[model samples]
Target: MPHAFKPGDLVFAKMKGYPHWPARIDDIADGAVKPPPNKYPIFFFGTHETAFLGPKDLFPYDKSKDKYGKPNKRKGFNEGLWEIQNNPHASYS
Candidate 1:
């Protein structure tokens, strides 16, 4: 209970039976890849494929409106599948 979220903020990854989508908070820590053993510190989303969530599975991406209220192109979850890098250089052998 000490990570409301940072680094780009804009999330939504409920995952409790699944179906919450939307995410964008690339670094609460554990960037260049390094998870397993104590987990919970790598919640990088946007292009999906890097998780360790907890904290209620994260949430906080209410852009305001889009259900016809207009102004909201916020569409996440497999939106493109991939292509959002920075220090991505895998190696979990």
Candidate 2:
């Protein structure tokens, strides 16, 4: 049977254009609805970042070494997430 990842399990997350970043499963939702493309979000390590990503894009952590040893760092912040936290529109551009 397909099993969902549990909290505290280390994983890698994939988003459009961004690198497969280092992240961990922080929490899991019920069998409720989710984004069309993804199931849940990830908790990034160093930057304390978080984002929604497809469950299929995740790994059991060590599998990453099969291809490369580590994942690349995320490029920039998510406008959608930042806007609500503290909207700073048109400052970096």
Candidate 3:
């Protein structure tokens, strides 16, 4: 099966202050590690909810390795699991 996320893959994520922040899939889930469904394997962008949603432009892809490139790790709040944002337009700042 195709990986869940890979580097270089363009993705749509919601960054703090910037909702639905456009980002690149710079990382993926480590095969040895498994986070909850609500938790994104790739970088956590303002929580899964605030992250990519349908109808958005090129968004998150399957998880994969980050070889042949700079190490891209997860990014987002870690205080408890990231809750998917209800409104993509809603500001969290």
Best by the lDDT measure: 2
Scored by TM-score, the top model is 2
- Over the stretch 1-93, how does candidate 1's per-residue lDDT look in tens digits? 445565565555556554555545554444566544444443434444557675466655554212212222444434412312332223211
- On a 0 to 100 scale, what is the lDDT of residue 80 in model 3? 11
Q: List the residue pairs that clash in candidate 1.
A: none
Tens digit of lDDT per residue, candidate 3, span 38-88?
344333335433233222233442221122112223454321122222232
Q: TM-scores of all models? A: 0.23, 0.55, 0.27
Per-residue lDDT of 47 in model 2: 53
Give stretches of model 2 more than 4 Å off: 28-38, 70-93
Q: Residue-wise lDDT of candidate 2 within 2-88, one digit each (tens)?
A: 467766666656667765555666564698445445456567544566666667788665667355333343443243234223432
Candidate 1 total steric clashes? 0
Which ten-residue region of model 1 has the weakest summed lDDT?
64-73
Error of 2 at 35 (Å): 7.1
